[PDB]
């Protein structure tokens, strides 16, 4: 009689029918991953069309329900997830315009090709770019290539981005949101939970607190990176001014991982390498997955169901078929999960396997939950749960214990300093770039600033917060920072910041429960079934209750914190601060490479 | 377990299970009901807004993992009531 019973019946219907269609779509996606023939291309075309039509029809018939007359929190959040119309809230002509422009973006980015002064060479984001940046140390090549690519992509997508700002603002306004910034913030909105309510600006205050408590560490690391750049090339960088954007080590300043060969403080010491050892033992993909499952059993997580080994593909299919093998794992369900990734004899493959195995375990943890809750409590929990296990496996004590590294060695001071430098430059270099991109997108959706000073204001703030300078000054006729992949396919970046914060918090709390003393980066989560049950206590939750409560089930705190970030790098920060006794700290935004 | 025998590739769509009725059940009862369930206090022809079909689909594939693989289950019911017993449990034989 009451609306609650009708809502529950419709959620059971949606659960079952969406399960059927999503299973079909995910099997089609795995077919895409394995066999890329035009036949399964068309099959996936019709499967996705049917799934989208079913989802739209279910949402439309769900729009007849009201959120005010229902009290159950799980059912309330399920209806809220159902009511997210998205593109259908606006007119058909506008929606088809938006989808055509997104297809245009996809085509342009996938076919983005830049010509050198000699047009005989044909590059396209992949044949070069990455390899140019990560193998060539020439200033002229990087400057010319990045400048030309940025210029052409901006030239081909400036008004597209402008109409995107307009249309996303209109969509958010039509969907009871002030701006598309609030639309993106709506994922973290939690209401109806006492002591667990969070608005759209509480996360903003938390991010500003992270800024305030993080700035000195990043400024010191920027000073060290720029000083090493001085030692490598003294005539192209000012001793106080900020560094040009094209001197960050990767495509767009996201990662400083490639700066290892120039930023290692002690090059004589041998890095922790088990590669030669796994060719000593002749390691294979089946053995690597068995080792991962041994590690997961050592933390009380369940075994590998036979379907995994039976249907999941663990090695490349020769040359008869081509497989895109970026480490990925979707949610098939009903106990069916599988992994597709290229298994080479490498150590980054160890991290990727561990990360996606943690992802699989988190995915299977909430299997018994309904469809709308069969996901991470927020968008970053899955990646954080994946990354914690890989980070734990990267410690040398684990390698010593599990036999890959022989017992008769001890941890060396400079080697562990280099390893901690690796884990620093591979993580903390992405946080400031995530902050800039997400904040710029935030006030782009807000509309506080006119169209006429976007690039100027953006680059000035870059110089002022992270010291990212344009090697060639650009006017309002450029769209350089919109060239990234995720902004180029409409994806939020808060996921990465939350992933890093959550993985550090989870490691801190899990190690505290597991009772390991000394430097924290050397701790391991092994033979700690109490900690395994503690982890499962949040793994099984899914989206039934707020992600803040899920975090409270591990750390005991309801909000994000910088304390894991500060504590994980205590000895590294001590060493940098004792070495910074005779170096400049800070930057000046006035200096630009073309102002002499 | 019955996966090779029952679950079929491209979808096994023969088994139907009900979900909703007017009231609760009684043990050992047959309720095959080709009557479309109604909700929202608006009786309808069926299969529309707030019109639910009680039976749903047993989506079965041979790749499903354990937890929802089609299981063949049979329940044997006995009664210890006074009556002429007819189903007696067998005897045995030995050497001479
Ligand atoms: C494997 O690829 C072929 C085309 O070469 C395709 O016909 C077949 O359906 C694919 N198999 C699967 C399981 O996707
Ligand atoms: C809320 O939903 C849960 C899960 O379906 C159920 O067990 C519980 O009884 C519901 N509570 C109310 C008040 O309907
Ligand atoms: C491992 O490497 C090769 C065999 O793969 C051989 O030298 C020896 O068995 C091992 N030790 C060293 C130092 O190479
Ligand atoms: C956990 O205990 C097993 C049992 O011997 C041992 O082989 C393994 O190395 C231990 N893991 C550690 C110490 O990380
Ligand atoms: C680190 O450990 C080494 C031993 O390999 C030792 O010689 C050195 O004094 C220690 N301290 C520093 C700062 O290197
Ligand atoms: Cl940039
Ligand atoms: Zn992944």
Question: What are its keywords?
Answer:
part of a larger assembly; 2 chains; A: 596 residues; mainly alpha; 2 strands; 1% strand; globular; B: 96 residues; two-stranded antiparallel sheet; binds 2-acetamido-2-deoxy-beta-D-glucopyranose; binds chloride ion; binds zinc ion
Percent strand of chain A equals under 5%
What compounds sit in this structure?
Answer: 2-acetamido-2-deoxy-beta-D-glucopyranose, chloride ion, zinc ion
* Proportion of helical residues of chain A: 55-70%
Question: What characteristic shape of chain A results from the CA principal axes?
Answer: globular
Order of helices and strands of chain A: HHHHHHHHEHHHHHHHHHHEHHHHH
Biggest interface between chains = A-B, 28 and 21 residues
Shape of chain B: flat
Provide structural commentary.
This is part of a larger assembly, with chains A (596 residues) and B (96 residues). The termini of chain A are far apart. In chain A, helix 4 packs antiparallel against helix 6 and helix 14 packs across helix 19. Chain A has a two-stranded parallel sheet with strand order 1-2. Chain A is built from 23 helices and two strands. Chain A is mostly helical. By secondary structure, chain B is low in regular secondary structure. In chain B, 0% of the residues lie in helices and 10% in strands. Chain B is built from no helices and four strands. Chain B is flat. At the A-B interface, helix 1 and helix 12 of A face loops of B. The site of one 2-acetamido-2-deoxy-beta-D-glucopyranose has 6 residues of chain A, from helix 1 and helix 2. It is classed as viral protein. The entry lists the keywords SARS-CoV-2, complex, Spike, viral protein. The entry is titled "BA.2.86 Spike in complex with bovine ACE2 (bound 1 ACE2)". Chain A is Angiotensin-converting enzyme. The organism of A is Bos taurus.
């Amino acid at each position: 009689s009451t609306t609650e019973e009708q809502a529950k019946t419709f959620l059971e219907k949606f659960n079952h029918e969406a399960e059927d269609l999503s299973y079909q779509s995910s099997l089609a996606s795995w077919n895409y991953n394995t066999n890329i023939t035009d036949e399964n291309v068309q099959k996936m075309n019709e499967a996705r069309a049917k799934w989208s039509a079913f989802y739209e029809e279910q949402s439309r018939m769900a729009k007849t329900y009201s959120l005010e007359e229902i009290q159950n929190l799980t059912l309330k959040r399920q209806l809220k997830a159902l009511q997210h119309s998205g593109t259908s809230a606006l007119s058909a002509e506008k929606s088809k315009r938006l989808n055509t422009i997104l297809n245009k973006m996809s085509t342009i980015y996938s076919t983005g090709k830049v010509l050198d002064p000699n047009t005989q060479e044909c590059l396209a984001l992949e044949p070069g770019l990455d390899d140019i940046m990560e193998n060539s140390r020439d200033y002229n090549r990087r400057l010319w290539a990045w400048e030309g690519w940025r210029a052409e992509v901006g030239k081909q997508l400036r008004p597209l981005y402008e109409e995107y700002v307009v249309l996303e603002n209109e969509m958010a306004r039509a969907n009871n949101y002030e701006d598309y910034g609030d639309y993106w913030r709506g994922d973290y909105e939690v209401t109806g939970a006492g002591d667990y309510d969070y608005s759209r600006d509480q996360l903003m205050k938390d991010v500003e607190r992270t800024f305030a408590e993080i700035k000195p560490l990043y400024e010191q690391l920027h000073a060290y990176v720029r000083a090493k750049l001085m030692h490598t090339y003294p005539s192209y960088i000012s001793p106080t001014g900020c560094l040009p954007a094209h001197l960050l080590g990767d495509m767009w300043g996201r990662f400083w991982t490639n700066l290892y060969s120039l930023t290692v403080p002690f090059e004589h010491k041998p890095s922790i390498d088990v590669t030669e050892k796994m060719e000593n033992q002749s390691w294979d993909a089946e053995r690597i997955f068995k080792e991962a499952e041994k590690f997961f059993v050592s933390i009380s997580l369940p075994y590998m169901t036979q379907g995994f080994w039976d249907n999941s593909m663990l090695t490349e299919p020769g040359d008869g078929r081509k497989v895109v093998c970026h480490p990925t794992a979707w949610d098939l369900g009903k106990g069916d999960f599988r992994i597709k990734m290229c298994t080479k004899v490498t150590m980054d493959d160890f991290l990727t396997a561990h990360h996606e195995m943690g992802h699989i375990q988190y995915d299977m943890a909430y299997a018994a939950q309904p469809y709308l809750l069969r996901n991470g409590a927020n968008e970053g929990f899955h990646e954080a749960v994946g990354e914690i296990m890989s980070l734990s496996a990267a410690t040398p004590h684990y390698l010593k214990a599990l036999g890959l590294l022989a017992p008769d060695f001890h941890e060396d001071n400079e080697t562990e300093i280099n390893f901690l430098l690796k884990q620093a430059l591979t993580i903390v270099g992405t946080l400031p770039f995530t902050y800039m991109l997400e904040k710029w997108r935030w006030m782009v959706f807000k509309g506080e600033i006119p169209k006429q000073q976007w690039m100027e204001k953006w680059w000035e703030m870059k110089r002022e917060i992270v010291g990212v300078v344009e090697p060639l000054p650009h006017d309002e006729t450029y769209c350089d920072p919109a060239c990234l992949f995720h902004v180029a396919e409409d994806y939020s970046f808060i996921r990465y910041y939350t992933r890093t914060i959550y993985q550090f918090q989870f490691h801190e709390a899990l190690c505290k429960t597991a009772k390991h003393e000394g430097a924290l980066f050397k701790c391991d989560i092994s033979n700690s079934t109490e900690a395994g049950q503690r982890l499962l206590q949040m793994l099984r939750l899914g989206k039934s209750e707020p992600w803040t409560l899920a975090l409270e089930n591990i750390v005991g705190i309801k909000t994000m914190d910088v304390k894991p970030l500060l504590n994980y790098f205590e000895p590294l920060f001590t060493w940098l601060k004792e070495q910074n006794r005779n170096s400049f700290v800070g930057w000046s935004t006035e200096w630009t490479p073309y102002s002499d | 377990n019955s996966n090779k025998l029952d679950s079929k590739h491209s979808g096994n769509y023969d088994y139907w299970y009900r979900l909703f009725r007017k009231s609760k059940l009684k043990p050992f009862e047959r309720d095959i009901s080709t009557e479309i369930y109604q909700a929202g206090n608006k009786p309808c022809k069926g299969k529309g807004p707030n019109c639910y079909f009680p039976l749903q689909s047993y989506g079965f594939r041979p790749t499903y993992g354990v937890g929802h693989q089609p299981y063949r289950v049979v329940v044997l019911s006995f009664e210890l009531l006074h009556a002429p017993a007819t189903v007696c449990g067998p005897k045995k034989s030995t050497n001479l």
